[PDB]
Amino acid sequence: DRSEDARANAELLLKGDEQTHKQRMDIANILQSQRQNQPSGSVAETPQ
Amino acid sequence: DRSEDARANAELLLKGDEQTHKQRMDIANILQSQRQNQPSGSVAETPQ
């Protein structure tokens, strides 16, 4: 059991690992294009 | 087990380490360009 409990342990580390990356990369590109579009809106004007 | 539990221990330290940096650098540059664009919007006017 403790054996498989340790087994469940990397499970948590999976979500951790996996979804940490989720965060990381998601916001990354998010920021990126945001700024690209900022440059877009700097050449002219955002226009609401 | 406790051995591999210690093993899971740096796992947490990984996300910690890794994603701490995520934070750090992300917001860093975030702030940076924000300010660059502030200078952009200071020369003229943000224009909504």
UniProtKB/Swiss-Prot annotation, chains A, B:
Function: Forms the portal vertex of the capsid. This portal plays critical roles in head assembly, genome packaging, neck/tail attachment, and genome ejection. Procapsid assembly may initiate with a nucleation complex composed of portal and scaffolding proteins. The portal protein multimerizes as a single ring-shaped homododecamer arranged around a central channel. Switches upon genome packaging from an asymmetrical conformation in the procapsid (PC-portal) to a symmetrical ring in the mature capsid (MV-portal). This change of conformation may serve as a signal for headful packaging.
UniProt-annotated location(s): Virion
Name of the protein this chain belongs to: Portal protein
Organism name: Salmonella phage P22 (Bacteriophage P22)
Complex and partners: Homododecamer. Interacts with the terminase large subunit; this interaction allows the packaging of viral DNA. Interacts (via C-terminus) with the head-to-tail adapter protein gp4; this interaction participates in the head completion. Interacts with the scaffolding protein; this interaction initiates procapsid assembly, thereby ensuring incorporation of only one portal ring per capsid. Interacts with the capsid protein.
Residue window of the full protein shown: 678 to 725 of 725
Sequence similarity: Belongs to the p22likevirus portal protein family.
